[PDB]
Each structure stands twice: as structure tokens, then as C-alpha cells.
Design goal:
Number of strands of chain A: 2
Keywords: isoprenoid synthase, enzyme function initiative, EFI, transferase, Structural Genomics
Distance between the termini of chain A: 14 Å
CATH class of chain A: Mainly Alpha
Strand order of the largest sheet of chain A: 1-2
Strand content of chain A: under 5%
Oligomer: homotetramer
Number of helices of chain A: 15
Largest interface: C-D, 46 and 42 residues
Number of domains of chain A: 1
CATH topology of chain A: Farnesyl Diphosphate Synthase
PDB class: transferase
Structural class of chain A: mainly alpha
Chains A, B, C, D: Trans-hexaprenyltranstransferase
Largest sheet of chain A: 2 strands, antiparallel
Entry title: Crystal structure of polyprenyl synthase PATL_3739 (TARGET EFI-509195) FROM PSEUDOALTEROMONAS ATLANTICA, COMPLEX WITH INORGANIC PHOSPHATE AND AN UNKNOWN LIGAND
Assembly: tetrameric
Order of helices and strands of chain A: HHHHEEHHHHHHHHHHH
Radius of gyration of chain A: 20 Å
Helix content of chain A: over 70%
CATH superfamily of chain A: Farnesyl Diphosphate Synthase
Amino acid sequence: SMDLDHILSLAEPDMLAVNQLIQKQVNSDVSLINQLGFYIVNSGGKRLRPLLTVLAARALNIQTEQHHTLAAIIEFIHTATLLHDDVVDESTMRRGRETANEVFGNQASVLVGDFLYTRSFQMMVTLDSMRVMQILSDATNVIAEGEVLQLMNCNDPDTTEESYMEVIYSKTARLFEAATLLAGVLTKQSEAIENAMQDYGKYLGTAFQLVDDIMDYANMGDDLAEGKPTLPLLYAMWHGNEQQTAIIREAIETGNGMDNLTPILETMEQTGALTYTKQQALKASQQAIDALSPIEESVYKEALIGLAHISVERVA
Amino acid sequence: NLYFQSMDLDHILSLAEPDMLAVNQLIQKQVNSDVSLINQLGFYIVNSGGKRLRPLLTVLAARALNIQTEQHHTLAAIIEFIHTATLLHDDVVDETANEVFGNQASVLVGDFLYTRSFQMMVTLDSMRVMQILSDATNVIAEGEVLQLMNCNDPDTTEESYMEVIYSKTARLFEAATLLAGVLTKQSEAIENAMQDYGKYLGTAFQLVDDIMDYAMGDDLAEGKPTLPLLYAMWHGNEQQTAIIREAIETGNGMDNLTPILETMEQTGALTYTKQQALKASQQAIDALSPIEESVYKEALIGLAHISVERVA
Amino acid sequence: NLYFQSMDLDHILSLAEPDMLAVNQLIQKQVNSDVSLINQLGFYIVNSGGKRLRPLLTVLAARALNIQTEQHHTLAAIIEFIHTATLLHDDVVDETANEVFGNQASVLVGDFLYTRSFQMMVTLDSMRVMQILSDATNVIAEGEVLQLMNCNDPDTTEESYMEVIYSKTARLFEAATLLAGVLTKQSEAIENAMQDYGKYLGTAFQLVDDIMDYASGDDLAEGKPTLPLLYAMWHGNEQQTAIIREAIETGNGMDNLTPILETMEQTGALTYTKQQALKASQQAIDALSPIEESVYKEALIGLAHISVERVA
Amino acid sequence: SMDLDHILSLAEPDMLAVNQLIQKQVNSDVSLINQLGFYIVNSGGKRLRPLLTVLAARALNIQTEQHHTLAAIIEFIHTATLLHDDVVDESTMRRGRETANEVFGNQASVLVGDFLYTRSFQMMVTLDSMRVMQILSDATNVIAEGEVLQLMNCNDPDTTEESYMEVIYSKTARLFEAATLLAGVLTKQSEAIENAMQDYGKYLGTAFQLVDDIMDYASNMGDDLAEGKPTLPLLYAMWHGNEQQTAIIREAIETGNGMDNLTPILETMEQTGALTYTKQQALKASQQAIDALSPIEESVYKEALIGLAHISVERVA
């Protein structure tokens, strides 16, 4: 499969245009918006969602440059979400750097999130497709719902596997799914090709999230400290002995224990909790690949298959 | 003390009631979610008071333009969701468990509402509706951040304070009335009349709100530069100007409460702010000239009078 | 803003929301009439703020007693209609074209809601329910008249002030909680416990309300002798006592607002009344002893704390 | 057949008990309630509804004294309605005497109304019948609705004959209908007999009100016009008069002006036969009440029920 260097090289001409657009579309008459927008936009995100979007639009031989605007739209939505999450979580650090709410305060972060969300809709309007906006209005409502679903799960050790997977789907997979779907919408593909791209995005997002959650136990236990129960921790809790179950249950309820997870890590190894989670990741990764079957052959399709392989490479 | 207050208000509310009930019912359907926590919190913030004004305006405006559909019900709901969301997001405090959960609830319920309003917009199946509301919602956001910037800035101009009023509060009124015209396929001139009515009505409401904060509210405490406080600073004497400046910058206005309120009285600061509100109220009424006569047009005129009732 | 008030309140509302939503929809069904004017006015009165506490109490109480039906929804609506009808009838002014129609609608919509509440009682198909509520509403009528008798009477005792609270306000809370017991077929000591909880909770709320009127002042202008004004008069100096006496006799206090408010502070009048509220609050909590432990019982304790949160 | 003196004489034993009940059952701990309730109960009402109640019960051979309590219940409800109406209408006189709201103020009148209403329910409880309370809670809701329907009609010259009749039924006849129906319920009659007593009370109530509205324009005179209340005589005269007469009646209704000189309005009524038309409706209603009593067993009590129906339209007929 195609490696990251080549994927990026393939995508760079498009990603340069998207970067320019992301930076310029922050503009406002209000200086605080320009500052905070600058800060969040230029803090060094991996820009994975717009990369997906542009590779997808090319894979479907797009004739316009509308995938640049669409890519900018997706990243604005994701950025709006990040700003709000960091206030909601009271995060202090992101991308090795102080968070926007730490630098500018909670109030300003929330409001500029709203500025970026609404700005992303002004941009959607320029694509002149009511369907684009139906999909994204739907997607963003789901994201908001997933955020509350995650809050309901905070410090809840009774959080079920289904509830956990629903948060992955609503809060992460749905936006990847929307991105790839909308590449098909822009290029006027059939329902079945739209479904293929939609599925690749969904399963890819799911894989990325599962692996992020795995990597958190290989700082370690950032999720635990924030009171966020994830599958490795839950599986270990469900299948361990009574003592292991109790300490994990305690850890989830309190958010204590990040500075020494030894007995929790041991429980994961013994129950196969990480292995189980790794298998769901690999599964999702393969499902993303299989979903691309119909897509015409091109270097861009190989790039999309590449990403699905990269998403789980630290686990495969 | 509801049926007492105004003869026009009694008729206004009664005329609007079938529409307002329909809106209330639509809101209860559209606020609903697949997530238990959202339904639990959402119920109380949507159904409570302080929800009446913008939907009332919206349905009265659509009836005045002789709407033939029920799309004004959806539009009324969209406007109140936008309003409720922006309110919740303006309740966010900077750096207890009360404030942490308040912040969380305010952001996430706000986000649910804001996003749901856009879903509802799409059901109207109109690109122009999306263009208008996407621009309006962006301007409201710019408005809210501009207000934040102006917090504790004693050099805030009059123009800048009015830009806040317009962009934060008035723009939404303006969009609501504009869109009544759009849904009913009115001419440009009619659209402009309605747009201007909404704009100026909203401006009046906001100014009057700022006046009533003194004739006591937290604008002084927060160190928010509103017109009455700014004017009194601009027309007070050497020391009066200096204490008000300090109050804005620091927030210690409650220490010097008595002398600050005296300055407002002596400079006629509240009087000046009252004049601007009455002007706005009149500009709203004036903007309706091209609208054909009806009970609904009379209601819209009534609301303009009611906005400044407490300061006329 | 609702979500910043209390962690207890957050949990209580979330816990009650499924019931409170059902009550809301039931109220809208049962407020409807064949007379368009009743619907036009009724809509706004029933969906206003200040509608939530008594239904909240009722559903929480019925859940705390493990109710197996949805009759608590009907009971909650009945209790809110009674409250609303009585409020409307307490808005009547003695003698103004706004005030003429205001009286008419207040009386007539009040009568509609009062009568509709009795029709709803009958659907519960319990003679004990009819007996309890006929007694409660009669006592509430008595309490409102005793309040009217005390208007402008400076020789009003502390006992007499309390008797109004028990009859006018607390009795409704008491009936609501008792009836939760009755509908769930509890024992006397349980009924007695719930009854007492309602009584003292309602007493606490009313005491705090009277304090909050002077930490805002409508009661002063009307010459309504509440405990904060009376205590100040009893323990003020000769002049302060005479000023407060006159203020009650003639409804004149707004002229002497500053000396009077100062007297309340100087005499500890507000603090004294705050203590009585805290006593009531605590008596209500103590009354729940025999109630099985549950999240709903915990919610009722939370309500008791919330009643005096602004005071405590 | 039977004259008013014989009717009152026959009913005297029951009405003594009822009068005592009505005076005693006002009792409360609150002095102002005792005062105001005393004033209204002892101001000299006709006691027509309790009279009707007790005659109806005797006619159905009631074995208990529950009809005293029922009759007192009905009068208390009627009394609560008067107190509220006089506040809504801002009336100053009643039974040649200052109204309670004039003596005590509006607020007290309204609240004491509520006291009487709730007290009447406390008395209903003692009859230990849920169906009774269903009937009276339904009846009293319809009364309340009727009061608002009347309010909507105030100063409205476009008030229809149907809307005017609907007010009569809901505001006046419905309580008569319920009184006599409940005399059937208390004595365990069949559905056919309940319906018969129900209809007698309804049509009787209708007749009384129609005559009241007619008598407002014959011999204070024109009391309804002043309150902006369009009644059938005035409305009919408007519909069938010429353009000038129509215009002045339309003006009279909208403004509530003209009570002190009705000359041209009365002339319009004479010419259009508007009083005559309204008299026919009253007679019709009276006859409808008598027909309705066809299945009730004979007695001096039934003959008093027929006698009241004849008495209702005496002045007119």
C-alpha cells in the first residue's frame, strides 16, 4: 500500500489551497475573532478530515475546485467542536501548546466556535446545494448529541459497549462519513458509489478513534483522568477478577490513578482488553477498505486505502 | 398582573395565540432528542418565559404579509432556537461544580439547539433562507465577541456600542421580519420595510433594556460599557469621568454607586438614551408605511409602542 | 442560567422531567375550551413562569411513594390550576380601562380554571380526594380573605401573619403531598409525614418570598404587613416605628423607603425571618424520616434546601 | 293551575330548613367571610332554584332530607355566580340595596364567591355521590364558559340569535337543568325520568331568562343595554327595523349609551314586534317544560312544577 509521504505528496497541491482557505476564512471585523481563529487554526492540527475529503474528491475525478471549499468547511466544523470540547473538558493543553480557552478564556472560545460553525454554513451556501446542507446540519446535530452522550458516560462505570460505540460513531465517525459522502455528492455519483464513500469514511473514523483510545494506554491514561471510560478499560473491568473490577470501577468513578496504572495495565494484558480493542480497530479498518471496492482505480484510491492501513499500523 | 398591563398587548397576544400555541407545540416536537440528558435539560430552557417575544414578532409579521402556509411556525421556532442557543453560550463563565456543569450544559445544549435550528432551516427548502440565516447567525456571533472585547474598555465609542446592539440583538429581529417577507414572496420594497421594522424594533428593545438596568442590574458590576454609563462619563466633570472610567476598567462601580448614578442624572445620560430608543421605536413604525392595513399591522405598530412603554 | 443555580436543582429537574413534560401536555389538553376568548387568554396564563414548583413537588412526592399509575399527572395539573385560579382572583383591584378588563378576565378565566380543576378531581374517582380538596380549597379561600383583612392593619400579630401562610400558601403544598400519599395507599404515619413535609416546605417558600420582596418592593407600597416589616416596627426606635405604622395604614412606605429598609437591617428583621424559614425548611426535612430511601426522597430533601438557598 | 301562594305554602316546610342551612353553612373562622356571606344571603333573594329543587324532589317521592342540602348547594353556586357577576359588571345595586362589592370591595366579593363555591363542594361530599359532583362540576364549568361568552357578546351588535341563546342555556338554564336532574339522581330514577326532569329544568330556566330580558324593556329600565349586553328584544328590533332604527340600536349596543331615553328604541320594538317575538320564545320554552313533565307521577308537587312554568310567563302571557 501507499505510504504517508506519498499520500501527502499526492494531496499537497489541494492541501495548500485548503490551508490558504482555512486561514483566510477566519476573517472578521472583530479583532478577538481574528486572533483566536488564528491561534486555533495555526496550532498544527493533522488536518486529516480535509485530507480525506480532497483525496476522495480526486478519486472521483472532480472537475471543479469545490472540494477545497468543502474541505475547509469540514475542518471549520471540527475546529468549532474542538474549541467547545476544551471548554467543556476544561483542557489546558492541545497539540503540545496552551488551549485557546486557556489563552483567550472560555467565553471567547465558545463564541468563536459559533463564528466558525456559522461561517462554515456561509461557505456551504456558495456550493449551492440544499443536500450538502441537509447532510451537514444532520451531521453536526449528531455531533452535538454525541458530546452529551459522552458527558452522560463521564465517570460512569456502568457504561455499556453499545454506549461507547455510539459515542465513537456520533462524535467522530459521523464527520468522516459526511466528508467522504459529500465528495460523492459534489461529483454527482450514483446512490451506490455515495454509499461506498459514506461507508469508507465511517469505518475509517471508527478505526482512527478505536486506535487513539488504545494508544492512550500504550500521557498514558489521559482518558481515565478526564473520567472518560473507553473500551480497553471497560473490557478489562468486565472480564477481570473481583479485585481488578473494583479498582477500575473506582478509577472510573473518581478519575484517580493516572500516575500509576500498573495493576490496571496488568488487568488489560490478562483479559486481552487491548487485543480485543485492537481487533475491533482492524475490523473497522478492513471494512473501510472493502467499502472502496466499487471506486474507480487511481493513485487517489490507493491513497485512501493507504490511510486505512496507516490508521491501524501501530496496532497491526 | 398579565391581563392588566396594556390594552393593545391584550389584543396583540389574543390575535397571535393560535399561532403561538402552534409554535409552542412545534418547539416541543423539534426540541426532542435521542439523548436522555438533552431532553431532561432542554425541556426547562425551551418552555420557560423569555421565549415569547421573537416568535410573536415572527408570526405577527407573517400574518401581516398574509402568509398562506404554516412555514412561519417553523421560522418562529428557528429564531427562538437561535436566540436560546446564543443566550446559553453568553452564560459561559471564565476561570465550583455548579459553574463547571453550568458551562457544560450551556455549551452542549446550546450546540444541540443551534444545530437543530439549522436542520429546521433546511426543511424550508430555500437557498435564500440559508444565505440570510447563515449570514445573520455569523453577524450575531461577531456581535457577541465584540461585546466581550468591549467589556472593561472605557474608550468604547458610541458607534461601537450601537454596532453591538445591532449585530448581537437587532440582527435577529431583522432576519425574522425579513424572512416573513421572503416566505410570502414579497417585493424588495416590502422586504426592506420589514427588515427595517425588525432592526429598529430590536434596537429599541435593547436600548430600553440598558436603561432599565439603572432605572438595579449587573452592567455596573460587570463593568459593561452601556450608553447611559458611557454618556455620563463623557459629560461628567473631571472626577466623575475618572470614577466611571475606573468602574468600567476594574468593576468596582458598586463602591461608587451613589456618585455614578448622580452623574447619570446630572448629565441627562438616561434621558439621552431614552431619546435614542424612542427614535428607534418611531423608525420601526415609520418603516411599515408600505404594508397594507390590517389587525396584524396594527399589532406590529403596538409592539413598537410597547417596546418603549416604560420610558415614554 | 437555570443550570448555574444548584447541583441539587440540576438533578431534581432532570429526575422530574419525564413527569413534568407529561404534566405540561396534560395541562394544555385540559386548559382547552369551546370559548375562543378563554383559549386566547388561557394559553399565556398557563404557560407563564411560576407554574412549575407545585407540579414538581407533586410528581416527586408520588414517585417517592412508588406510584404505579399516571394519576399523579392529573393531580399535578389540578394543583397548578388551583394555584393559578387563586392567583388570578388575588389580582382583583378595588375601585382604569385596563383595570376594568383586567378584573373581568382575571375573575372569569379564574372561574373557568377553578371549575375545570374540580372536573379533573372527579376523574380520579375517589371520594377521599374530593373531601381533601374541597376542604383545602375552602381553607385557601379563607386564607386569602384573612390576608385581605390584614391589609393596612399595623396591629397584625405574628401569629396572624403565620396563619395566612398556613391557610393561603402552605395548605396547597400540604394537600398535594397528602394526596400523593392517598393515591399510593400509604399509611397514616406516611400520609402525616408527607402532609407535614408539604406544609413546612410551603411555609419556608412563603417566608423566603417575603424576605426577597425587600431584597429586590411591592408589599411595601400595598401596605401588606409581612414579618420583615412588622418585626422592624416592633423593634425599631420611636420614629422608625411610627413611620412603619403609617406606611402600613396608608400604603405610604415608598416615600420613606430608605429609613424603613435601614430599620429592617438595624433591627435584624430580615435575619429573624430568615431563621423562621430555616426552621420551617428543617421541620420539612425531619418530617420525611419514615419515607423509604430513594433518589426521589433525596429530591424532596433537595427542594427543602433549595427553598432557603437564597436565605441560607 | 296552582298559584304562587299555594306553591310557597306547600314548599314552606322544606324552605325553612333550607334557609337555615343556607345561613348556617356560610360559617367560617374569618370575620369578613361571615360578614359578607351574611349580607348576600340575607339581602332577599327569590330562592327560585332551591324552591325548584325541593318541589322536584318531593315530586319524585324522596324519602330522605338530602334535597335540603342539594337545594342549599345550588343556591350557594348561584350566590357565588352573583358575587362574581357584580364584580365583572361593576354593579352597585341589587334587590334595591347596595351590592356586596360596593359594601365590601371587589376583592372580598370575588374571594367570598370562591369560599361559597368550595363550601358547596364540601356539602356535595356529604351526599357521598361522585356522579353528583360530576354533574355539578360539569354544570359549573359550563356556567363559567357562559360568563365569558357573555363577555365576548358585550358591545357586539353582530351577536347572533344562536350566541344569545347559548348564553341563556349555559349561564342560566344549565343550573336549573342540573338542580332538577339531581333531584332524579338523589331518588334513584331511571334514565328516562332523569332526562324528563333535566329538560323541564332547562326549558323552565330558559323561559325565566327570556322573560327577564323582555321585562327589562317595560314597566332601572334598560339595565342590560347600559351594561352593553345585547338581548333578543333589542337584537330583533335591530334586524327588522329600518336603516335609521338599526343604526341607533347598533350604536346603543356598541357604546352602552341611551338608557335614560329609550323612546325611539322602544318604538322600534313595538313596530317590529320584537317584544312579541321574544314573548313567543318564552311561551314555547314554558310549554316545552310542561310537556317534559308528562311521565312524572301526579301530586300536588308536580302541579307546583307546572305552576311555576305558568308563573314564569305570567307577566308576558
